Design a protein around this nucleic acid. Sequence first.
RNA 1: AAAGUUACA
RNA 2: CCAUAGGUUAAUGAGGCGAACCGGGGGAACUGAAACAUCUAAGUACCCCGAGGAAAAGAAAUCAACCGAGAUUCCCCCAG
RNA 3: UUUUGUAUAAUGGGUCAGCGACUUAUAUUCUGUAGCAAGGUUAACCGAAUAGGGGAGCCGAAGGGAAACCGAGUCUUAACUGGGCGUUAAGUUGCAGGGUAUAGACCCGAAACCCGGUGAUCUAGCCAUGGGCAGGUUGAAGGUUGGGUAACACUAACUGGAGGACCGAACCGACUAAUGUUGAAAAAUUAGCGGAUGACUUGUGGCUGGGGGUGAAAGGCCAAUCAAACCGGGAGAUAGCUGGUUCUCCCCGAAAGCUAUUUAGGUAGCGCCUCGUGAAUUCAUCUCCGGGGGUAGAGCACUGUUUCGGCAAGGGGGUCAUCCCGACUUACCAACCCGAUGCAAACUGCGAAUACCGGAGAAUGUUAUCACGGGAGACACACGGCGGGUGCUAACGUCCGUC
RNA 4: GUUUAUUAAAAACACAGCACUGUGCAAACACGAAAGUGGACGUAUACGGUGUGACGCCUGCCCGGUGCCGGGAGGUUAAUUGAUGGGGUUAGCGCAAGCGAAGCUCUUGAUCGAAGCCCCGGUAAACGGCGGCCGUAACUAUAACGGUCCUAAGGUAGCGA
RNA 5: UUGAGCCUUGAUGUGUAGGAUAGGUGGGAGGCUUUGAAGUGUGGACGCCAGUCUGCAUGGAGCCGACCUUGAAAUACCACCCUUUAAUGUUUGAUGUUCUAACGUUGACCCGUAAUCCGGGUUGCGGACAGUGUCUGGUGGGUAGUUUGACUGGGGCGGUCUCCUCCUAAAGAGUAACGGAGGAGCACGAAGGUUGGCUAAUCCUGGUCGGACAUCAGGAGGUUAGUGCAAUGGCAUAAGCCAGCUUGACUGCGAGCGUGACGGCGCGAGCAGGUGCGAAAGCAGGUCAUAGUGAUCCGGUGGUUCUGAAUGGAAGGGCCAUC
RNA 6: GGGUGAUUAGCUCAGCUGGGAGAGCACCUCCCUAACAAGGAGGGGGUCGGCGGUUCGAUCCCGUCAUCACCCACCA
Length: 551
Amino acid sequence: AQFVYTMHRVGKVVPPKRHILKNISLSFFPGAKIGVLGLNGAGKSTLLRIMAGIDKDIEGEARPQPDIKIGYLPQEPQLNPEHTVRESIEEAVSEVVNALKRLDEVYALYADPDADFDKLAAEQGRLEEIIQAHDGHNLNVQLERAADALRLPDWDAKIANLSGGERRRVALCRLLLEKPDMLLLDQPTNHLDAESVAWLERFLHDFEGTVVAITHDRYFLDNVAGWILELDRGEGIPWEGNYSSWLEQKDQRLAQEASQEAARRKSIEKELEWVRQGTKGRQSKGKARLARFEELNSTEYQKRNETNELFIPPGPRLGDKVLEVSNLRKSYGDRLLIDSLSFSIPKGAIVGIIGPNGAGKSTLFRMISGQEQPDSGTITLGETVKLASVDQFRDSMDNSKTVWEEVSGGLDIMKIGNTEMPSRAYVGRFNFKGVDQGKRVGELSGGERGRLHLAKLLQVGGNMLLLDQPTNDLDIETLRALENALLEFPGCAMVISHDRWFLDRIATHILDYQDEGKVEFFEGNFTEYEEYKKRTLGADALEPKRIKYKR
RNA sequence: AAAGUUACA
RNA sequence: CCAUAGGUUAAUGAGGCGAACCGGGGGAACUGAAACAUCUAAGUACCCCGAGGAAAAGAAAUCAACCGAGAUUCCCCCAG
RNA sequence: UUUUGUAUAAUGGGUCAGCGACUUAUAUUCUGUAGCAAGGUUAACCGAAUAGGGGAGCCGAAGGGAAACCGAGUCUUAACUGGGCGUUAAGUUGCAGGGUAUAGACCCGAAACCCGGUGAUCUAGCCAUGGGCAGGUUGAAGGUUGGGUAACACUAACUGGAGGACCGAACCGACUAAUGUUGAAAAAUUAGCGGAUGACUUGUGGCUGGGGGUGAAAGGCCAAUCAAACCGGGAGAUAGCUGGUUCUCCCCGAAAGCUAUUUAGGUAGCGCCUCGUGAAUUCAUCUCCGGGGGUAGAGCACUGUUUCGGCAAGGGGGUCAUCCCGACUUACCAACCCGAUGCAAACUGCGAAUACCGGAGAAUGUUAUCACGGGAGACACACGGCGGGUGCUAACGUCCGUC
RNA sequence: GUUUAUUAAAAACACAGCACUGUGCAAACACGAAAGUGGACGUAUACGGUGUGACGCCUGCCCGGUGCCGGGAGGUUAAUUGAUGGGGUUAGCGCAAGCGAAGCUCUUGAUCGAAGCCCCGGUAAACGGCGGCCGUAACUAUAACGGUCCUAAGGUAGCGA
RNA sequence: UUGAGCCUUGAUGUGUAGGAUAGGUGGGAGGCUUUGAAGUGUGGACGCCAGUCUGCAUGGAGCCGACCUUGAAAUACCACCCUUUAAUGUUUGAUGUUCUAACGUUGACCCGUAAUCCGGGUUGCGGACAGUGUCUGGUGGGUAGUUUGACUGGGGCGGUCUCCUCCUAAAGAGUAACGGAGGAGCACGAAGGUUGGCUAAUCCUGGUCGGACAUCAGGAGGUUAGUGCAAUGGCAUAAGCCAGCUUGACUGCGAGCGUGACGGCGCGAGCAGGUGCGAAAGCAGGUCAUAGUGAUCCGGUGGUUCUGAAUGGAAGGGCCAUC
RNA sequence: GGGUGAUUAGCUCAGCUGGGAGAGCACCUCCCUAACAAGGAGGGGGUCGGCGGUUCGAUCCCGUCAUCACCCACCA
Ligand SMILES: Nc1ncnc2c1ncn2[C@@H]1O[C@H](COP(=O)(O)OP(=O)(O)OP(=O)(O)O)[C@@H](O)[C@H]1O
Ligand SMILES: Nc1ncnc2c1ncn2[C@@H]1O[C@H](COP(=O)(O)OP(=O)(O)OP(=O)(O)O)[C@@H](O)[C@H]1O
Ligand SMILES: [Mg+2]
Ligand SMILES: [Mg+2]
Ligand SMILES: [Mg+2]
Ligand SMILES: [Mg+2]
Ligand SMILES: [Mg+2]
Ligand SMILES: [Mg+2]
Ligand SMILES: [Mg+2]
Ligand SMILES: [Mg+2]
Ligand SMILES: [Mg+2]
Ligand SMILES: [Mg+2]
Ligand SMILES: [Mg+2]
Ligand SMILES: [Mg+2]
Ligand SMILES: [Mg+2]
Ligand SMILES: [Mg+2]
Ligand SMILES: [Mg+2]
Ligand SMILES: [Mg+2]
Ligand SMILES: [Mg+2]
Ligand SMILES: [Mg+2]
Ligand SMILES: [Mg+2]
Ligand SMILES: [Mg+2]
Ligand SMILES: [Mg+2]
Ligand SMILES: [Mg+2]
Ligand SMILES: [Mg+2]
Ligand code: NA
Ligand code: NA
């Protein structure tokens, strides 16, 4: 069984001397499915950037087999805002389109005999060969089939005027149109809804080539992965099994490491007590034991686990009238997202906003924050309400600035409502508890980017929160910390998310989008929402179709 | 399940 | 009945000793390195086996450089 | 002899006579001398063999560059106005001598390491075999006969003769003292002392052998030797350590410092010594001239420390609305400004004498100066004067500078 | 009883007794390149090693450390095997460049890979270990008692200048 | 019993539009089935739930193309086929059980032989285990060879060991002590280069929250400030502070010096080539200076046909830059 | 004589090359109770040993002294 990829002694060093990856020796075999786990900063995206060939700085040797295609989807897929849907899409088939245009230019040869045959007719064969390498002529059908299978927006739509989920779908389609042999995915379900994620995971299970996927979720991982690469601090640990068994193994590993560190502390204290005694005569003391103690005094890497410190500052006191919408309606062109929506938000409530992609979830936040003007108006907030909004996109932070400068603005004392707070203490409240204040925004990882985003955008101190997909790149630990912080909140919050479990653990009012632009509002949590649906239900259970890619 | 004590004419 | 091992009798040799030299089987350490462990001393001292008047080697599956020389051994250079 | 320094009460020598320590291979550099000279010279070897042949070679006349390569030039560099190394000075082979290298390498001297053998006639254990233990005590089990008991159990007397049992000779030891310590004796004698039928003692003969044995275990014993026997060899181990180093005269004449050191008592480069060669009013002294100081002394503008006055903010405890504006007390702690007065290695708005650096001028001085080359020794210093650190303004203390 | 022949005869060694442990016999163990011997012409009521040391009353708590015993799941892991990638050479395609078949080579090293170690239990007549500070009762004299920190556990019986 | 691979035989391929599950080109015409059907009843499998594939039963001659309005055409073969899958083979690999014939036997019997040695022969029992050889991981004071620094008011213990600043240090340099005080093992693509511009600390007076001290205004003062970090020396022409443009934090050299015992270290005008700033004169080969460090060996990386053990390459060397 | 460590609320102790400074029980009030204990609710405390120092911060960093706790004083 010839492998597909190999890494031997692969090591990476980041600023100062930090071995994110140390001695990672691995082989990737045909038909494999690997899920890469770890905390927010472990080095998963680093390892995939190495596997994509983008990073060659590493120590060791990492290489794929020759003439195998690696399709790399990062966790920051960039697209051309000028481009429309088709203008961004065809770049994945640009060879065929460019060659076809060249054929159109060449066809004037047989009209005008200028440099007739010995100069370009021979190259016409090379052009027809590059068409033949693909289907080429039946290309519009390929594009239509891909768009149908991935539920892409119509090609006339622009890219800036696109929802985050559909943006990720465009990136997925442009990646998979290349038709590679090894997929590298960096959180491929970042902004996807339930149907999109289910289709993607079925496709991944069907994929013939190798798949290496980074995921902070567990159910999609149980679906797709064949084995897990833990990727702890420094070292990568393979594992055969499911997420819960791997979790058990991980707790056992961390408990053993904690016990060994405690024993090390014990032995070091004992030997220090020995070192701090006198010679007692003209006898040994001994340099061998001194050397043993000096080498025993070493350094161990503590886990940079976020855990429960996510600091949501308390806003101003909130009256009973918080938010009210009456007959809200919004449409774009001919497709309408919200139609005759009315609801009131009692104080203290967490509102789980759910629905498919581009259904209007983010545009609702735009109206509430006042950046968009509804057709049917009647959005209102109580006079005590102070709004703090967290966007679906992090594209507002200066990647040059450091963490502390970007969060705090450079002022040593930070004002949060009534109380002045030390900026360094406030930043450290968001797990940047060391010299992590010095890291650059661009050099931060995706999960650290989300944490810094929350830190910068919760400082306004509003007692109404408008969080749009707040747990995008976060792992389970930061997710739990955020859930606890949201629970210990005096004000009220509206959270848009696609994590059903995270939304269920905190939501008190469900705002769910449906077809034909109806936004059903339900006061209650997800358990009683499901119970209400069961009480007044409809008889069927089959959502998907799982269309195809090939042919 | 827990439930101790509290000087006399 | 086999046959072999074994036994018996003959003839034929060799045993042991000896100074060095010679071929082989094993093979130190002190010392030097200003310590020492790679390294050196040194394949030396020593032990053992086997010859001979010498012994070993010896007649290219050797060198050399498109010219060539022609088995082995020893001496002087090459060259510290 | 060793030392800073010895009559030293530090070492060595009783004395005589004899012996006793810088040698010999090669190789290399320098000096003298001899021969030839841009040449000199052969080695092995042949040889009627100190000749004569033999020129294989070696050194020299050309260097530069890592090299290719170029060449009285070359290298560097894109190139050098450049710069480094060379060109404008004879070598070579003997002989004698001074060094160095390898050999024991000036002589003597370890404790040790390795190799091969000799030892269990001493002593450790064990094995086979066969001897020794005067004399006297105590009385175990068991047994018998009676009492007993249903039978036992038990009990008495008699018996019996156990025991790493008791006392004590031979025998085996070795606790105490004295003597003896160039002894009667390289461990004993004398007077006492312990065991003395046992894990005893003893004869003869065996067996275990050196990182091995044996050990009722002390590192004990293994031929008067044992934390690794003895004999022979490697072997003249090695010894930065000690000792010793032998005839005479003449000339010059040190150092005990710096730097480095697995280095401090060793060594290396430099300083200082000597010999040779070559060179300049080269060097030294004094006079004059041109310089830089930040020392002694002094001073208090600076950094600090100080006293005393005069102005005096502020600061600490009471008299009050023991919140405000503070409204009033210091026989005041107190730097800030001024007037006086001190102190300072790490203070300076000042500042010598000397010393040092350079120039000129004589006189004087066996060139005293510098460079190169051969040979060293020395790198433990001592005290005294002057300037100081340290110490106690101690030390024949210790550490620097200078004489 | 033994011991430092030759300054130590003792409280030292031994000892009967005790315990732990190994050992199923071609025993463990020891001497020995080996053969083979002892153990033993014995056979777990036997033999070896270790500690303690008649007898009497006893021998408390700690398995965290070191060792030993058991476990096998997972991790790390040797020699082996030599996939894969890279390079050297060159028949040719080019005779300007450069590429490069087959072979042969240099290197790199996928896959396979046991015991140990990590890990999980046990074991102290295995080697070993067996706490602080503060307050508190008719005098502060002391604390039966209490608070708290730490530990693997905090020294029990009995002895004690 | 399995694991893996390979060859066959099957089975399988729901987009939209389309008659309805359409893999790809085919390449061709009609074949299929009658060697018994286009079906009904029945059983399993797949099932993107439409459905097409299937073992059967009497009945056994009709299903699609061809026709085209779809990007494409009609399981209407064998294909070498792609995708998944399942079966018999095939190799191999693992584990297990049985066997005997290697091997063991310190079981019995027989012979050599008048011998509990040894050998041979029968037989029993184990048995490809055990055991040994080579290679290899672990353990291994059982044994062996060694190491285990120096200074030091004796040694040990404590402290120190390299570099920078001041004093000791005696007005040139240098100058010791286990003398007296402190620091370094870096920082900076600006905090470097230039060209312009600018001048502090502290105090007094007036001024909204606002005072002992924030920002403002004017007066004294005159560097008591500042310098990336110790101390010393220096700095107004600022070496201090601000801004524009920038990369001289250049490459090859280098008269001449200073300082070292040397290794080495430092300063440097000027020359050549290119550059930045400035209108120019000019300045710039790092930073106000003095700390911020490590010889050689060995090896790594890039460049250079300098070398290349017959020749052409190459390996390995050298040179340059660097780790 | 030399060396080391500790100092944090009333007590015993945790405390990030910074971030009012924390835990048990003590203390305060209120419930519960005839009344106390125990139990339950609320609450407050601080020289971070002290003058010192590179610092965006000194509790943890920064020489020192103050005290109590140790350790060593060997050949001699
Ligand atoms: N140049 C850099 N210098 C210093 N730290 C860096 C640099 N680049 C990245 N890092 C750090 O390396 C860490 C690893 O980041 P990385 O993106 O690999 O993590 P991740 O686990 O893959 O993230 P995520 O799951 O959130 O996408 C982060 O903490 C990041 O800040
Ligand atoms: N300016 C616009 N013109 C046209 N269409 C627009 C415009 N802005 C947004 N849309 C579209 O309208 C829909 C609204 O989507 P929106 O960004 O509000 O979030 P969502 O789709 O509800 O959520 P999510 O961000 O999670 O996908 C999307 O389909 C989006 O592409
Ligand atoms: Mg040796
Ligand atoms: Mg030596
Ligand atoms: Mg030695
Ligand atoms: Mg022959
Ligand atoms: Mg006398
Ligand atoms: Mg004398
Ligand atoms: Mg001569
Ligand atoms: Mg003998
Ligand atoms: Mg007597
Ligand atoms: Mg005898
Ligand atoms: Mg011997
Ligand atoms: Mg001898
Ligand atoms: Mg020798
Ligand atoms: Mg004289
Ligand atoms: Mg010396
Ligand atoms: Mg002196
Ligand atoms: Mg244990
Ligand atoms: Mg085990
Ligand atoms: Mg040893
Ligand atoms: Mg200027
Ligand atoms: Mg220039
Ligand atoms: Mg210009
Ligand atoms: Mg080369
Ligand atoms: Na990532
Ligand atoms: Na959106």
